[PDB]
Design a protein around this ligand. Structure first.
Ligand SMILES: Nc1nc2c(ncn2[C@@H]2O[C@H](COP(=O)(O)OP(=O)(O)OP(=O)(O)O)[C@@H](O)[C@H]2O)c(=O)[nH]1
Ligand SMILES: Nc1nc2c(ncn2[C@@H]2O[C@H](COP(=O)(O)OP(=O)(O)OP(=O)(O)O)[C@@H](O)[C@H]2O)c(=O)[nH]1
Ligand SMILES: [Mg+2]
Ligand SMILES: [Mg+2]
Lengths: 178, 403, 403, 178
């Protein structure tokens, strides 16, 4: 029988946690989503020639759930700590709130650093909003730095909108959890 | 010589498929060749059956509208091993039944021993993969091309593509892009990353457009009764389906009171598996669902999901918790009850009944789980028990009954 | 209920046979019961075939001139395992072919796996025993009773008895004697230790007489062409044969010039194996052979014997030497040549031709053996080479030709 | 493939060597023999649940063949030294000629002592011939004595005419040769 891996997804609200979960598991692009009233997702994945069942636990990024969120933390095999590459506050929260919170509950559970919304690195309007505050989209290199400093297995990035990087992210998550 | 040329093409297709690792398509090429030789030999009075003996392995055999018994026997043995390599074990017996009387008449006991050895291993494999889930026969996609400029005769044509194992939409997408980027040059190929029915009346003739959509095999109730196993629902399949969101008014997504769903069914000209890994779409139709029908639909999927996870003797604890937590610890399902079950259309009897089975299954899963945790949880379980019980209250309220 | 009573008797016969270790007879009882239930179910439209589907397993099925599919399936599985236990492997497939479509329709993949496992092991066994010779299906005897006084209705009746493995005449004799010595008392049972056709007109009514004669399956040339293997010559057999010596003039044995042979062929009312280990003789005839025909007969057996020993890739050295030494280092074969090949009847062409093949095979065996010995012989071989060469001389002489 | 055992039969002329070979292998009684021009016999035998092929080498008992007889002696797995229980000279020749000759060529090859024509222990005319010379048919006990003195695996006896003992003789021969 197939092994089932617990993957928990954390990060600031609106970085795109739910979107990349839905897009990966359904192959749908955001525009094609059929609104759902339920949470979490289960997908079969092929790693090293063998199938695995991937259990994806979504979480709220808001402070209003700081109390309930860690309930889902026991038994986790791997964490995905997400931030938007076009949201610098997202980035900082990785070091300030996210890895701290997950290392606090799950001392030796692995985690990847996941950068989201990479399609917006090219968006004129986004670029401009960031310039007006003297900022630039986080780059893969500055993200890689953060990853090893904080000691994540690694950094991977994707776009739910174009689906670039999407497959790689969850492959690495399984590799990391093994 | 027509049959020999047919056999020629089929044999070369097969070499291509083997090189590509598309083993079921290679397998179908062998079956097709074997059927052709069988039909010929049957007309000469050399062999007993012909074409239709293989029709149960594939209905595409119809298309097959020097050669001797010995060639036939070798081809049958090739079908058997090809079907083994494709992992379509269930089908090997239909081939071997045709050669068994020949081996018996020839007193070829070692060949008999070998084929029975394969059949034994075949059926052992069948019960194994039926339990473990480790057999992955493929994923399906609607692919549609747009752009006279670069596709020419290929413009406006929709196909069903059959991909390896668990190929994700992105993987077939780039293999397609990269294929026509080498063909046509990078800057000139665009992917229509959306499944809405497009009118060419708003594309730009400067570009080649490829539209890719994940679809799954579709079956009516009768077909679901006839196709009893996961294999039988994965073999000889001609119809596929996807869903898109819409509202009568504006955007595609909206409030549960306005969310509609269009379900499109596509029919290919041939069944899968076939001697090719893509097949033209022959015909299509769709069916629109109302907001409440959408609700019923999604609710019924969840109950069945929770039930099946519980009904398991070999319960998956993590998958149970995933589906269970995403059911009670989220709005949520309540949003349906609120919009559809408080003081319309008297079909409403069904929604209520799904909800009843919903509370029960959630309850059963709560139960199942209480017996699964190692205390490192318990608090988690308790919260879910809390949440669950709380929502039962509101349902019982709105429905003016127990739960 | 006739069929159920038939099934009752057959089932009890089978228990008796199993207890006695007469497994082929037990097997035939299962086949017979299965055929009966099949025939019944076929008439009701429940099952496809009936009686004749089993006719190839045994022609005795004809005699079979509550019950449901499930009972049938269990009985078929019983036939298969019974046939396994009887070591009649070649026959298992005829049974399993009848249940395979039922298991397929039921999606019973584990049962399918198991029966194919048995068939694989069956055919593996077949090629093994076809090489090794280790399968021993039984020995056959003509048994005839004489004596109204103690046998009553059993007087004057001849049967064919089928005995275990390699049962010698003495073993069945005493099991028979001892059986009727417990029945009738020691001093009153006599064995007619001779196979001559007895006229009751010279027996003593004071005693029970049992006559036992070793017989072997008999086949005509056509049957020998149809029955290609040792198994096919050991299954579904109805005719048996023995030979006795006679001379036209006096004693039964005499000089080669006067030695005749009577060959008696006996036909049983049923074929073996059957639901009983003995079967009434239905009919018999005989054929007398002349002294020269006797000669030809015995010479042809020797050449074939020497040939077969030589033609072997896996040559048995001791058996070769035994047959070879008993051919050249003995009178001997020469006695034939002398009486039948020196200056009648022009059929004589045949004798000469057997003799030619005889000298050749002896030569070939001499050759084969020269390559087999470890010098501890060599002198033995040399003498046989001597003897051989010497007799070739005399033949070449009398036949006025080479050798 | 089946093992083949070499059994060589020796003893005075007319003790019944050829008769018990023919009767065992054919199941025939002496009266029913079809005269043959060839020598030696091969029969399959069941010992301990397994089949064996038994190769039976006949020999002449006369002095006229003393020279040729031992040619067939190499490779022998077992010997049968025969004597008629109603022929005292037969008996004596076992010790005087037969075991000596076979021990001389085949030092450690086993042999049984085989007594023949036991049916003649009851024959009036035979009994009488023996009485007139002050003799009696050899008894199983006096034969058993001889057997161990000479060191044969054992003594077995039979009648080719009634076939009593016949099966046992060749069973023991195979057992002895193993
Ligand atoms: N351009 C772009 N937008 C995205 C992408 N992924 C998500 N979004 C949009 O960003 C918004 C936030 O997406 P969510 O997936 O709901 O973010 P979230 O992290 O789950 O928010 P919470 O559930 O509240 O924690 C939505 O409007 C998405 O459509 C992306 O890859 N590219
Ligand atoms: N009454 C009786 N006579 C027997 C028995 N066995 C053999 N005879 C008879 O004794 C005579 C000698 O028999 P053979 O078998 O030829 O003796 P042999 O030892 O082979 O003689 P050689 O080949 O010359 O060494 C024949 O007439 C047989 O019919 C027996 O068991 N009982
Ligand atoms: Mg969200
Ligand atoms: Mg003799």
């Amino acid at each position: 029988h197939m092994q089932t891996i617990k993957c928990v997804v954390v990060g600031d609200g609106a970085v795109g946690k739910t979107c990349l979960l839905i897009s990966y598991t359904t192959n749908k692009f955001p525009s094609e989503y059929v609104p759902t009233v339920f949470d979490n997702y289960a997908v079969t994945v092929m790693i090293g020639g063998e199938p695995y069942t991937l259990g994806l636990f979504d979480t709220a990024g808001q402070e209003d759930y700081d109390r309930l969120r860690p309930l889902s933390y026991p038994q986790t095999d791997v964490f995905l700590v997400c931030f938007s590459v076009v949201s610098p506050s997202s980035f900082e929260n990785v070091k300030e709130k996210w890895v701290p919170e997950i290392t606090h509950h799950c001392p030796k559970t692995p985690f990847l650093l996941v950068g989201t919304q990479i399609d917006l690195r090219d968006d004129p309007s986004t670029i401009e909003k960031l310039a007006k505050n003297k900022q630039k989209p986080i780059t893969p290199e500055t993200a890689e730095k953060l990853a090893r400093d904080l000691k994540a297995v690694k950094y991977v990035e994707c776009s739910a909108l174009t689906q670039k990087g999407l497959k790689n992210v969850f492959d690495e998550a399984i590799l990391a959890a093994l | 010589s027509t049959p020999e040329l047919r056999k020629t093409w089929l044999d070369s297709m097969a070499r291509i498929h083997v090189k590509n690792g598309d083993l079921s398509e290679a397998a179908m090429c062998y079956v097709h060749v074997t059927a052709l030789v069988a039909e010929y030999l049957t007309r000469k009075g050399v062999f007993r059956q012909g074409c239709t003996a293989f029709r149960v392995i594939t209905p595409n055999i119809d298309e097959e509208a020097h050669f001797n018994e010995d060639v036939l026997m070798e081809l049958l043995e090739q079908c058997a091993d090809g079907l083994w390599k494709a992992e379509r074990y269930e089908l090997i017996a239909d081939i071997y039944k045709l050669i068994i009387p020949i081996y018996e008449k020839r007193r070829d006991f070692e060949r008999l021993a070998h084929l029975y050895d394969t059949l034994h291993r075949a059926y052992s494999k069948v019960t194994e993969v039926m339990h473990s889930g480790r057999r992955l026969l493929g994923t399906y996609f609607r692919v549609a091309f747009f752009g006279q400029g670069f596709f020419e005769d290929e413009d406006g044509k929709e196909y069903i593509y059959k991909e390896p194992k668990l190929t994700p939409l992105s993987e077939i997408s780039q293999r397609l892009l990269k294929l026509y980027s080498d063909k046509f040059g990078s800057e000139n190929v665009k992917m229509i990353q959306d499944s809405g029915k497009v009118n060419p009346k708003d594309l730009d003739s400067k570009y080649a457009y490829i539209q890719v959509t994940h679809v799954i095999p579709f079956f009516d109730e009768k077909e679901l009764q006839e196709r009893k196993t996961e294999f039988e629902r994965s073999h000889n399949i001609r119809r596929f389906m996807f869903e898109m969101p819409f509202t009568q008014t504006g955007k595609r997504q909206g409030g549960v009171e306005e969310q509609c769903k269009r379900r499109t069914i596509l029919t290919a000209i041939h069944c899968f598996p076939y001697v090719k890994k893509r097949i033209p779409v022959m015909y299509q139709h769709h069916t629109d669902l109302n907001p409440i029908e959408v609700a019923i639909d999604e609710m019924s999927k969840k109950v069945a999901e929770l039930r099946q996870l519980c009904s398991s003797a070999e319960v998956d604890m993590i998958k149970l918790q995933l589906k269970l937590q995403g059911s009670v610890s989220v709005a949520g399902p309540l949003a349906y009850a609120r919009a559809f079950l408080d003081d319309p259309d008297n079909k409403v009897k069904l929604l209520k009944e799904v909800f009843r089975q919903f509370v029960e299954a959630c309850g059963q899963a709560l139960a199942v789980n209480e017996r699964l945790i190692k205390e490192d949880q318990l608090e988690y379980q308790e919260e879910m028990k809390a949440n669950y019980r709380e929502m039962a209250k509101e349902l019982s309220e709105i429905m003016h009954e127990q739960l």
